[PDB]
Symmetry: C4
Subunit: 22 residues, 4 copies
Amino acid sequence: XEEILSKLYHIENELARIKKLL
Amino acid sequence: XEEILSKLYHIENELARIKKLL
Amino acid sequence: XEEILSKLYHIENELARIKKLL
Amino acid sequence: XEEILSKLYHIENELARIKKLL
Protein backbone atom coordinates (compact mmCIF):
# COMPACT_ATOMS: atom_id res chain seq x y z
CA UNK A 1 0.00 0.00 0.00
CA GLU A 2 0.76 3.54 -1.10
CA GLU A 3 1.72 5.54 2.01
CA ILE A 4 3.61 2.54 3.48
CA LEU A 5 5.51 2.04 0.24
CA SER A 6 6.52 5.70 -0.06
CA LYS A 7 7.89 5.80 3.42
CA LEU A 8 9.84 2.58 2.72
CA TYR A 9 11.40 4.29 -0.31
CA HIS A 10 12.05 7.38 1.78
CA ILE A 11 13.82 5.29 4.35
CA GLU A 12 15.90 3.65 1.60
CA ASN A 13 16.83 7.05 0.33
CA GLU A 14 17.80 8.26 3.84
CA LEU A 15 19.95 5.19 4.13
CA ALA A 16 21.43 5.99 0.72
CA ARG A 17 22.28 9.53 1.88
CA ILE A 18 23.82 8.01 5.08
CA LYS A 19 25.77 5.35 3.13
CA LYS A 20 27.43 8.28 1.20
CA LEU A 21 28.31 10.37 4.22
CA LEU A 22 29.91 7.36 5.75
CA UNK B 1 -2.04 -1.11 8.67
CA GLU B 2 -1.54 1.51 11.30
CA GLU B 3 1.07 -0.33 13.35
CA ILE B 4 3.42 -0.84 10.41
CA LEU B 5 3.06 2.82 9.49
CA SER B 6 3.69 3.91 13.06
CA LYS B 7 6.89 1.88 13.19
CA LEU B 8 7.99 3.38 9.84
CA TYR B 9 7.45 6.90 11.19
CA HIS B 10 9.60 6.06 14.19
CA ILE B 11 12.29 4.51 11.97
CA GLU B 12 12.21 7.44 9.54
CA ASN B 13 12.54 9.73 12.53
CA GLU B 14 15.50 7.76 14.05
CA LEU B 15 17.30 8.02 10.65
CA ALA B 16 16.79 11.73 10.03
CA ARG B 17 18.27 12.19 13.55
CA ILE B 18 21.24 9.90 12.84
CA LYS B 19 21.53 11.76 9.54
CA LYS B 20 21.93 15.40 10.74
CA LEU B 21 23.88 14.01 13.85
CA LEU B 22 26.62 13.20 11.34
CA UNK C 1 1.47 -9.01 10.45
CA GLU C 2 3.98 -11.19 12.27
CA GLU C 3 7.08 -11.49 10.06
CA ILE C 4 6.75 -7.83 8.92
CA LEU C 5 6.45 -6.66 12.52
CA SER C 6 9.49 -8.63 13.71
CA LYS C 7 11.67 -7.24 11.02
CA LEU C 8 10.46 -3.71 11.87
CA TYR C 9 11.53 -4.32 15.48
CA HIS C 10 14.80 -5.77 14.26
CA ILE C 11 15.43 -2.68 12.22
CA GLU C 12 14.63 -0.50 15.25
CA ASN C 13 17.09 -2.49 17.26
CA GLU C 14 19.80 -2.16 14.57
CA LEU C 15 19.17 1.54 14.60
CA ALA C 16 19.43 1.47 18.40
CA ARG C 17 22.80 -0.29 18.17
CA ILE C 18 23.89 2.32 15.55
CA LYS C 19 22.62 5.26 17.65
CA LYS C 20 24.97 4.02 20.46
CA LEU C 21 28.05 3.58 18.31
CA LEU C 22 27.56 7.05 17.02
CA UNK D 1 2.53 -8.31 1.57
CA GLU D 2 5.59 -9.44 -0.28
CA GLU D 3 6.72 -6.03 -1.51
CA ILE D 4 6.81 -4.51 1.97
CA LEU D 5 8.75 -7.50 3.24
CA SER D 6 11.18 -7.32 0.34
CA LYS D 7 11.87 -3.66 1.07
CA LEU D 8 12.40 -4.48 4.77
CA TYR D 9 14.94 -7.16 3.87
CA HIS D 10 16.81 -4.64 1.76
CA ILE D 11 16.66 -2.02 4.53
CA GLU D 12 17.74 -4.54 7.18
CA ASN D 13 20.59 -5.49 4.89
CA GLU D 14 21.67 -1.83 4.25
CA LEU D 15 21.77 -1.30 8.08
CA ALA D 16 23.76 -4.39 9.03
CA ARG D 17 26.28 -3.18 6.38
CA ILE D 18 26.34 0.37 7.76
CA LYS D 19 26.62 -1.25 11.18
CA LYS D 20 29.78 -3.40 10.77
CA LEU D 21 31.19 -0.59 8.39
CA LEU D 22 31.47 1.48 11.57
